[PDB]
Write an enzyme that holds these catalytic residues in place. Structure first.
Site, mmCIF file in Angstrom:
data_model
loop_
_atom_site.group_PDB
_atom_site.id
_atom_site.type_symbol
_atom_site.label_atom_id
_atom_site.label_comp_id
_atom_site.label_asym_id
_atom_site.label_seq_id
_atom_site.Cartn_x
_atom_site.Cartn_y
_atom_site.Cartn_z
ATOM 1 N N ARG A 46 -18.595 -11.259 -5.265
ATOM 2 C CA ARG A 46 -18.855 -10.072 -5.615
ATOM 3 C C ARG A 46 -20.184 -9.732 -5.536
ATOM 4 O O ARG A 46 -20.985 -10.611 -6.296
ATOM 5 C CB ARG A 46 -18.367 -9.394 -6.751
ATOM 6 C CG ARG A 46 -16.640 -9.705 -6.597
ATOM 7 C CD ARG A 46 -16.005 -9.121 -7.903
ATOM 8 N NE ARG A 46 -16.140 -7.532 -8.072
ATOM 9 C CZ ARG A 46 -15.449 -6.726 -8.994
ATOM 10 N NH1 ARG A 46 -14.573 -7.446 -9.798
ATOM 11 N NH2 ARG A 46 -15.778 -5.577 -9.204
ATOM 12 N N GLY A 47 -21.016 -8.722 -5.023
ATOM 13 C CA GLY A 47 -22.175 -8.408 -4.980
ATOM 14 C C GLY A 47 -22.444 -7.207 -5.473
ATOM 15 O O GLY A 47 -21.559 -6.274 -5.543
ATOM 16 N N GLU A 51 -19.125 -7.056 -0.951
ATOM 17 C CA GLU A 51 -17.948 -7.938 -1.143
ATOM 18 C C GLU A 51 -17.732 -8.606 0.008
ATOM 19 O O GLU A 51 -17.459 -8.174 0.908
ATOM 20 C CB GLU A 51 -16.684 -7.067 -1.889
ATOM 21 C CG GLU A 51 -16.820 -6.381 -3.065
ATOM 22 C CD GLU A 51 -15.572 -6.093 -3.982
ATOM 23 O OE1 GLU A 51 -14.837 -6.738 -4.316
ATOM 24 O OE2 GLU A 51 -15.275 -4.957 -3.865
ATOM 25 N N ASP A 155 -35.622 -11.379 0.708
ATOM 26 C CA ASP A 155 -34.532 -11.596 -0.240
ATOM 27 C C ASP A 155 -34.249 -13.132 -0.218
ATOM 28 O O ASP A 155 -33.121 -13.489 -0.312
ATOM 29 C CB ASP A 155 -33.516 -10.861 0.041
ATOM 30 C CG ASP A 155 -32.412 -10.764 -1.534
ATOM 31 O OD1 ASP A 155 -33.248 -11.155 -2.570
ATOM 32 O OD2 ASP A 155 -31.435 -10.437 -1.430
#
Ligand SMILES: Clc1nc2nn[nH]c2cc1Br
Length: 334
Positions: A46-47, A51, A155
């Site tokens: 889960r982020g 997901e 990122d």
């Protein structure tokens, strides 16, 4: 006055020489597949923006990974899709296989080539000195490629590096924050994770470039060779710069601010203080010394610079003596 402009040292105009549709993702038309071709097997993680599920392609019994996108601006979806399509087939870039929407909820989802649910964060505790150099080199291949294609990842962190250690292959994932580099463009500084934000993000300098990814890589390298996760352990975005300043020193920080005429947030005045530039030996101890070498420290020092223009490029990094043995081994067998 205003801030002083900046340009990337490498790959500066690659997007300018491309046709408009390569980087103008706002006008990109998305080719939607059929989600009925995929059945979800189990949740992987889960982020904050998505997901991730393990799934099966019904049409050919192929294992895939499905990333169900949480609601975000339409242009951000097109950006991640366009970047994934431009980079598809590149070295160690995750392969986007399909794009689907749920018929009822209209929620978009991306389907990727299958990888083993193992990221760099879970593995580096068991890595030898050679394995760290090997996988760092593999990450640099992906970064030099996407930079050469005019794209910043923005990122870079161990969670976004999937590694299949048994087969010694890795893939750089999560391109939802990635962006095209255009000379003179000012970007959002609210990117990357706190522990990996470059000083340009923390002092609110918007005309950054590919070198942002090289700071994040340096943060990863420091945490691995020193076994200190994270290396710069800030409580928030302000304290994050304080943690960096306690290591790199405040003198080079204010020189960096003076060089680009950056207007520093007044909150930093009473928290940065005065700090000398520390020697990397301060972080070496009996449990990480087998991962630390003069080559590793020299390489790390050239990544973690305040001045983004002074950091090694990805290609310059791949030629550092730190990777000489890795380069020789790949020349023999690959
Ligand atoms: Cl596991 C996985 N996670 C992701 N997050 N963003 N893109 C991704 C691709 C894969 Br494969």
């Amino acid at each position: 006055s205003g801030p002083v402009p900046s340009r990337a040292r490498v790959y500066t105009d690659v997007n300018t020489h491309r046709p408009r549709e390569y980087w103008d993702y706002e006008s990109h038309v998305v080719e939607w597949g059929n989600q009925d071709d995929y059945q979800l097997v189990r949740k992987l993680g889960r982020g904050k923006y998505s997901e991730v599920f393990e799934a099966i392609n019904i049409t050919n019994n192929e294992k895939v990974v499905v990333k169900i996108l949480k609601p975000v601006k339409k242009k951000k979806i097109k950006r991640e899709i366009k970047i994934l399509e431009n980079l598809r087939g590149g070295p160690n870039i995750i392969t986007l296989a399909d794009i689907v929407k749920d018929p009822v909820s209209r929620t978009p989802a991306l389907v990727f080539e299958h990888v083993n649910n193992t990221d760099f964060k879970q593995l580096y505790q068991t890595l030898t000195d050679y394995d760290i150099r090997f996988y760092m080199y593999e990450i640099l291949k992906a970064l030099d490629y996407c930079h050469s294609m005019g794209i910043m990842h923005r990122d870079v962190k161990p969670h976004n590096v999937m590694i299949d250690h048994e087969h010694r292959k890795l893939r750089l994932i999560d391109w939802g924050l990635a962006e095209f580099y255009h000379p003179g463009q000012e970007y959002n500084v609210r990117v990357a994770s706190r522990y990996f934000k470059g000083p340009e993000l923390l002092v609110d300098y918007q005309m950054y470039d590919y070198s942002l990814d090289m700071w994040s890589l340096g943060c990863m390298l420091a945490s691995m060779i020193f076994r200190k996760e994270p290396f710069f352990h800030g409580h928030d975005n302000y304290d994050q710069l304080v943690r960096i300043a306690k290591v790199l020193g405040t003198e080079d920080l204010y020189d960096y601010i003076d060089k680009y005429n950056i207007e520093l947030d007044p909150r930093f005045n009473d928290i940065l203080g005065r700090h000398s530039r520390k020697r990397w030996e301060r972080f070496v101890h009996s449990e990480n010394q087998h991962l630390v070498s003069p080559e590793a420290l020299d390489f790390l020092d050239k990544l973690l610079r305040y001045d983004h223009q002074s950091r090694l490029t990805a290609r310059e990094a791949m030629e550092h003596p730190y990777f000489y043995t890795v380069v020789k081994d790949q020349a023999r067998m690959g």
